[PDB]
CSV table of C-alpha atoms in Angstrom, one decimal:
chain,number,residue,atom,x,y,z
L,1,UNK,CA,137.9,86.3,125.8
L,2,UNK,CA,135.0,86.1,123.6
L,3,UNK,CA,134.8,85.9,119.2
L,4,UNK,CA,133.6,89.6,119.0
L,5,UNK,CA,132.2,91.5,115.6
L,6,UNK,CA,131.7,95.3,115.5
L,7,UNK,CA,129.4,96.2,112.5
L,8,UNK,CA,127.4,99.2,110.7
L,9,UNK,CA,123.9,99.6,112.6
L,10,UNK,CA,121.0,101.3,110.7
L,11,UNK,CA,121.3,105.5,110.8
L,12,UNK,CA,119.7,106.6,114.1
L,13,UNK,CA,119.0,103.0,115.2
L,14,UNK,CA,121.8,101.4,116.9
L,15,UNK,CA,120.1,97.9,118.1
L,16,UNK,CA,119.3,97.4,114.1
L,17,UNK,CA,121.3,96.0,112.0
L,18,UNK,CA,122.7,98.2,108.9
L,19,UNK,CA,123.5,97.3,105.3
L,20,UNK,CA,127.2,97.0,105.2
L,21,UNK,CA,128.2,93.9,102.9
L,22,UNK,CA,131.4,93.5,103.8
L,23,UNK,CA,130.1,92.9,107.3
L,24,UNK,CA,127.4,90.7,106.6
L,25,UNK,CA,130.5,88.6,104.8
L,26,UNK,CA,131.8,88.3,108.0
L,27,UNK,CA,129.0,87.6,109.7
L,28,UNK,CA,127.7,84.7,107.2
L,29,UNK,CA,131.2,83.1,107.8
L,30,UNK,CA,131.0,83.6,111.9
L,31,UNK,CA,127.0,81.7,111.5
L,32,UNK,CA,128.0,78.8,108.7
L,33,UNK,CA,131.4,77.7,110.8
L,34,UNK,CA,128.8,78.0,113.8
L,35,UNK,CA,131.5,79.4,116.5
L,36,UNK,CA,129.5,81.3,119.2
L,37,UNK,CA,130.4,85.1,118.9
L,38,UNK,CA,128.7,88.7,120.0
L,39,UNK,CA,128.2,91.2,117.6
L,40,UNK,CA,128.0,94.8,118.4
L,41,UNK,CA,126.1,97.0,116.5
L,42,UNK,CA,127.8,100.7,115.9
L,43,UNK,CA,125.9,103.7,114.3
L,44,UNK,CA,128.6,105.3,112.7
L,45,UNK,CA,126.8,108.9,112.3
L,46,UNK,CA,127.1,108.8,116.4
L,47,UNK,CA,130.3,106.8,117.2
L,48,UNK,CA,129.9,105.2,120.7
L,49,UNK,CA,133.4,105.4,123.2
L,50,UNK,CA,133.7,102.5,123.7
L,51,UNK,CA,133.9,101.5,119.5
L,52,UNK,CA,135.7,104.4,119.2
L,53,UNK,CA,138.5,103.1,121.3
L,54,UNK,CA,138.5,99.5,119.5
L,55,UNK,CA,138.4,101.1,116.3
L,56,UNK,CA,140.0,105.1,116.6
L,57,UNK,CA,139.3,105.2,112.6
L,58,UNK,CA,136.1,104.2,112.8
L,59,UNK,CA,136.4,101.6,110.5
L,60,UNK,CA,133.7,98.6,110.2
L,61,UNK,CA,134.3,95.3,110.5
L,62,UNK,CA,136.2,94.8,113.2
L,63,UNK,CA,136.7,91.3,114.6
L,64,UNK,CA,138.5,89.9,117.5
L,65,UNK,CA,139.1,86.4,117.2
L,66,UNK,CA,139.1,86.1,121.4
L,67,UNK,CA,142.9,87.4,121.7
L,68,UNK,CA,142.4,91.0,122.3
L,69,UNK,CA,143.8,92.0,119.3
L,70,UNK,CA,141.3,93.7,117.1
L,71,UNK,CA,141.8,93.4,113.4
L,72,UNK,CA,140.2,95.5,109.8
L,73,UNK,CA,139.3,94.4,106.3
L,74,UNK,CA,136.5,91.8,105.9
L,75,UNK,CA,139.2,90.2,103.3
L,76,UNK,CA,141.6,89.8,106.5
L,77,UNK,CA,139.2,88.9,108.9
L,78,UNK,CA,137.2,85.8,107.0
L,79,UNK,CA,141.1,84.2,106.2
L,80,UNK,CA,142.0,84.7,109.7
L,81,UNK,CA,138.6,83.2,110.7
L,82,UNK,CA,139.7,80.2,108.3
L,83,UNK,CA,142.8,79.7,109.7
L,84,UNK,CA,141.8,79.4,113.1
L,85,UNK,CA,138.3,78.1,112.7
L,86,UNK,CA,139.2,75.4,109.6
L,87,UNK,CA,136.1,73.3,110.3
L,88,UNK,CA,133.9,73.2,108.5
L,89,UNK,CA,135.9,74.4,105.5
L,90,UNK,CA,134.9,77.3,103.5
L,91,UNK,CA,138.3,77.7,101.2
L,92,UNK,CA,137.4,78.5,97.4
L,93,UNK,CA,139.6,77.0,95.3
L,94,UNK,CA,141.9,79.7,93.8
L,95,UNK,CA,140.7,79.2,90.3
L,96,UNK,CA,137.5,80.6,91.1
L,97,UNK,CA,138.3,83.4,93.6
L,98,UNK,CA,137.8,86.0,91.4
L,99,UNK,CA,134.6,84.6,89.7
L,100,UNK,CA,132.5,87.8,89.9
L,101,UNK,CA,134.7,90.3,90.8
L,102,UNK,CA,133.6,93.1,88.5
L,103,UNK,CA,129.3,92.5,89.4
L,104,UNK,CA,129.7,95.1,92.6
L,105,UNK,CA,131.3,97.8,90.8
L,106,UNK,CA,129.5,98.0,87.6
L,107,UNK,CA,126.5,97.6,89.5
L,108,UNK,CA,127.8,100.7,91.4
L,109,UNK,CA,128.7,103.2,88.3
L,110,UNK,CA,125.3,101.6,86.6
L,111,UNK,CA,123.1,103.0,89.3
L,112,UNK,CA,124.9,106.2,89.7
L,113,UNK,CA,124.3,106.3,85.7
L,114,UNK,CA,122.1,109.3,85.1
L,115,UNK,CA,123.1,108.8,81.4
L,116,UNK,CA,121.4,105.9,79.3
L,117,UNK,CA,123.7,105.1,76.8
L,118,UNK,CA,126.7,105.5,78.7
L,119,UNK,CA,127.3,101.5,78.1
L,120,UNK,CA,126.7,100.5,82.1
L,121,UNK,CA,123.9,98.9,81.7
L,122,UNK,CA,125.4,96.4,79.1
L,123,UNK,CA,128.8,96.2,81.0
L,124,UNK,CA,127.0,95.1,83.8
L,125,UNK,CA,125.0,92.6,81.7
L,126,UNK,CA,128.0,91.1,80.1
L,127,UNK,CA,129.7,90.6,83.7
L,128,UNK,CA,126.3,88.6,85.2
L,129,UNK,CA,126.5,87.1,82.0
L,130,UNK,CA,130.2,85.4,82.4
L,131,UNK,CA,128.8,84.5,85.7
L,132,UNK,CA,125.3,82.6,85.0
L,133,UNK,CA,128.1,81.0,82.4
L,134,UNK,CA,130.3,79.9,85.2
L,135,UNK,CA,127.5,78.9,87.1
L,136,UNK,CA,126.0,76.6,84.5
L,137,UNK,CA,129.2,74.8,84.1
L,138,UNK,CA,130.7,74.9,87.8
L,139,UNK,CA,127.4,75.5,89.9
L,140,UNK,CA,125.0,75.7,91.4
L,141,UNK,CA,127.8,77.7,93.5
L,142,UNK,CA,130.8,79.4,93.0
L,143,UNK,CA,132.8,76.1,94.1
L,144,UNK,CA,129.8,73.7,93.1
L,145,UNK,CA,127.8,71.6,95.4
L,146,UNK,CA,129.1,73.8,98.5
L,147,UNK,CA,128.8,77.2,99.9
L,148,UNK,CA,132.4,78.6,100.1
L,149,UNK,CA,134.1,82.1,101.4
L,150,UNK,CA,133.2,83.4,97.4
L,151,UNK,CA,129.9,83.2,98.2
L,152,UNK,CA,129.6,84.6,101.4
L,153,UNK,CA,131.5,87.6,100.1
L,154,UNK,CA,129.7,87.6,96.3
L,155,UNK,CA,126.3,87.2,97.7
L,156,UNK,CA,125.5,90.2,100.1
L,157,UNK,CA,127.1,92.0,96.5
L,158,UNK,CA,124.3,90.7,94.8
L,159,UNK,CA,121.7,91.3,97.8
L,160,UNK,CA,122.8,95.1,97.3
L,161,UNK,CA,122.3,94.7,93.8
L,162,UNK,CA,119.2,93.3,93.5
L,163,UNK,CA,117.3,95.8,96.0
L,164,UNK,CA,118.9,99.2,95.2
L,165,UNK,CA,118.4,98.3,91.1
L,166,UNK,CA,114.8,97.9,91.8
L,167,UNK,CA,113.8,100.5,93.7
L,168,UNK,CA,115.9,103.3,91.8
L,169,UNK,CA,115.9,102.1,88.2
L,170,UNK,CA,113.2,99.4,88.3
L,171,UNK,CA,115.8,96.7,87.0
L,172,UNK,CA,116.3,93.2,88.1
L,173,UNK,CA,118.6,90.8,86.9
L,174,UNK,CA,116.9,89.1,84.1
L,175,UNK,CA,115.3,85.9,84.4
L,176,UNK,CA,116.9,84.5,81.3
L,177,UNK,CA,120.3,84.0,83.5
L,178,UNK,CA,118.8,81.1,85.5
L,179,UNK,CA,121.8,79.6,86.9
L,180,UNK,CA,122.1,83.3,88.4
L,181,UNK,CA,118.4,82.9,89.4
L,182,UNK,CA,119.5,80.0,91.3
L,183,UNK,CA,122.3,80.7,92.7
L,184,UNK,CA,120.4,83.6,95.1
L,185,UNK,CA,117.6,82.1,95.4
L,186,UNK,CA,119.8,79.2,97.2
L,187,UNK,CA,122.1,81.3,98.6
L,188,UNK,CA,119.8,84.0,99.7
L,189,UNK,CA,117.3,81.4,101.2
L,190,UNK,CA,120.0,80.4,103.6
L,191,UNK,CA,119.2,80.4,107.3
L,192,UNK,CA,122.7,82.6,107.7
L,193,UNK,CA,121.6,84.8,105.2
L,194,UNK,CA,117.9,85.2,106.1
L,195,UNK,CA,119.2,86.0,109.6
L,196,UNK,CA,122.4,88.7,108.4
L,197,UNK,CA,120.5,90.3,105.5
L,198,UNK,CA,119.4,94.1,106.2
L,199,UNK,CA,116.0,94.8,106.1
L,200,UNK,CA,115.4,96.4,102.4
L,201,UNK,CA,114.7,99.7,103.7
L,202,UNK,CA,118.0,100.5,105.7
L,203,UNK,CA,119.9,99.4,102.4
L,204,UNK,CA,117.8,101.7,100.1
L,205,UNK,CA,118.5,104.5,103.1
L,206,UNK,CA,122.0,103.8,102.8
L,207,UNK,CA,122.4,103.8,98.6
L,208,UNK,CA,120.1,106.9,98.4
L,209,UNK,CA,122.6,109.8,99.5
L,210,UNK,CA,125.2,108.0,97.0
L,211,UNK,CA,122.5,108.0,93.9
């Protein structure tokens, strides 16, 4: 059988892709190991029979690794992808796994923040700042010279990030953190991620009704 992905389409669009992260994860892992694989697109505000029957929870991703057995969790899937699909490696050594793991939810309660001294904006700050200090020492990526699984999950984190900051509080990461700077600009230049990334407006459409 064939490597199969179910992930979010845009709202009312289902042959375009939508802005989950956790899918795009998968998907960057499916593109760097280069194993051939359909994706099918679901929009989840009109939920499809067939997906329905794959998934009865509705849940996105879904990945069958060509078994017939379809499996949740984008933390699941890209191990099980590992495991079965070991070249080329992606493993990020434990020591760094959780490098970053407080960015996506301080970016969260920052731009839910309609209060401006609520201390998000610095929390935030301090957590891209113990990662452009990583990065400096360790970089340019989370494992060094090579793209690993961290990345694939950190950066469509940081794609989020970067658009929905912009367009609803006019921030950006600042420029001062240039080992951050560089780590997206690598990472985000990346024919996988050029070619998994949503198109800005589907993740602003998608962040809006949560603002």
């Amino acid at each position: 059988m064939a490597v199969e992905v179910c992930v979010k389409a845009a709202v009312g669009a289902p042959d375009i892709l939508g802005d989950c992260p956790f899918s795009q994860r998968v998907l960057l892992t499916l593109e760097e190991k280069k194993i051939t694989y359909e994706m099918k697109l679901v929009d989840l505000s009109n939920k499809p029979e067939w997906f329905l029957k794959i998934s009865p929870e509705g849940k996105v991703p879904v990945f069958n690794s060509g078994d017939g057995k379809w499996i949740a969790d984008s933390d699941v899937i890209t191990q099980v992808i590992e495991e079965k699909f070991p070249t080329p490696s992606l493993v990020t050594p434990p020591e760094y796994a959780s490098v970053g793991s407080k960015i996506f939810p301080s970016f969260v309660k920052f731009l839910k923040s309609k209060d401006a001294s609520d201390g998000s904006e610095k929390a935030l700050l301090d957590e891209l700042q113990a990662l452009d200090e990583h990065l400096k020492a360790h970089g340019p990526y989370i494992s060094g010279e090579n793209v690993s699984a961290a990345d694939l999950s950190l950066g469509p984190k940081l794609f989020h990030l970067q658009v929905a900051l912009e367009h609803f509080k006019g921030w950006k990461i600042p420029e001062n953190l240039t080992s951050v700077h560089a780590y997206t600009k690598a990472l985000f230049s990346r024919e996988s991620f050029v070619k998994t990334k949503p198109a800005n407006q589907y993740l602003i459409a998608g962040w809006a009704p949560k603002v």
